[PDB]
């Protein structure tokens, strides 16, 4: 070959991933309707195995085999931006649902927002703390990025550890707020919009934290150079996305919706 692009070795992970999607969806069907978690637990297991081996192989191809030329790296940058755009439009659907319900509250709610019988969380208590936590994590991840570009291994690891700690703190605070909330997902469209929008956000925080932990262990193993570290850049972009979604949730659901 005399181009710079990556011809990938034939791989089983696309098929295992597709079958994991069949097992998770047929598994959710079996859980919702036939009172059984068996297929779902097989699908989640095969999905985790597939993700692990697929991304392991991308690290082998890049760090170990040198297939990530600038042209390949530029493709991955576009791929991650486009993926983030698709996730923004997914959240847009949930914001649309929220504004539709809250701007024109129906007679069943008492014709008011919040609905009769809903006692919202105080946005100045744990939700404000959660806001400070994710904003702080956007600062610490930026410190980590600069440390890596400047060749500073110890400060990169410290800044990334702080970022992950804050992601975990957010997740534990949200778990506690879920438990303490006097309203539930079954509390009409208020509970529906609140828990589905914040719940998909929480999942994305867990995904983003996991991505940052992968970057932490790769950094511990010296995979990143001061100039070549796309996995870290992608995790940082994803992490900023999770921050920005939170700020929109905070202003929309917790503050303006209270």
């Amino acid at each position: 070959q005399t181009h710079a692009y990556h011809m990938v070795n034939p791989s089983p992970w696309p098929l295992t991933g597709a079958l994991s999607a069949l097992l998770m969806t047929s598994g959710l069907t079996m859980w919702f309707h036939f009172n059984s978690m068996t297929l779902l637990m097989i699908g989640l297991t095969t999905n985790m195995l597939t993700m692990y081996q697929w991304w392991r192989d991308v690290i082998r191809e890049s760090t170990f085999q040198g297939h990530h030329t600038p042209a390949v790296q530029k493709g991955l940058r576009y791929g991650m931006i486009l993926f983030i755009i698709s996730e923004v439009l997914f959240f847009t659907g949930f914001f649309w649902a929220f504004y539709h319900s809250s701007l024109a509250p129906t007679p069943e709610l008492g014709g008011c927002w919040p609905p009769t019988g809903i006692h919202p969380l105080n946005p100045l208590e744990v939700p404000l703390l959660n806001t400070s936590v994710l904003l702080a994590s956007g600062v610490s991840i930026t410190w980590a990025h600069h440390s890596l570009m400047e060749g500073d291994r110890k400060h990169m690891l410290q800044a990334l550890f702080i970022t992950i700690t804050l992601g975990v703190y957010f997740t534990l605070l949200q778990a506690s707020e879920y438990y303490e909330a006097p309203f539930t997902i079954s509390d009409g469209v208020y509970g529906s919009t609140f828990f589905v929008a914040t719940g998909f956000h929480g999942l994305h925080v867990i995904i983003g934290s996991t991505f940052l932990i992968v970057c932490f262990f790769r950094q511990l193993k010296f995979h990143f150079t001061s100039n070549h570290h796309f996995g870290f850049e992608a995790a940082a972009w994803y992490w900023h996305f999770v921050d920005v979604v939170w700020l929109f949730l905070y202003v929309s659901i917790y503050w303006w919706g209270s």
Partner: protein, 91 residues
Amino acid sequence: GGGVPTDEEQATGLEREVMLAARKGQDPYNILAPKATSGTKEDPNLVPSITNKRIVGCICEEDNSTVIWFWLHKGEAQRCPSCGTHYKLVP
């Protein structure tokens, strides 16, 4: 405050080949667009190849949307069948 490898230390495989060739001003992996000559029979466009034929696309005039494609073979210079521009294979 150090401990992060450099590309110079740790880049490998094709990434390293591209890095080292670029330091030398060389483009073995076709990252850059070649600059045209006058394209006469005396001053043909020189087309590198690792084999005895390569596809050429000729953008005959600036901003043409239509690219003209043809195999250029080792031997005497060939002409773009649209604009007559000369190309010569350098295997």
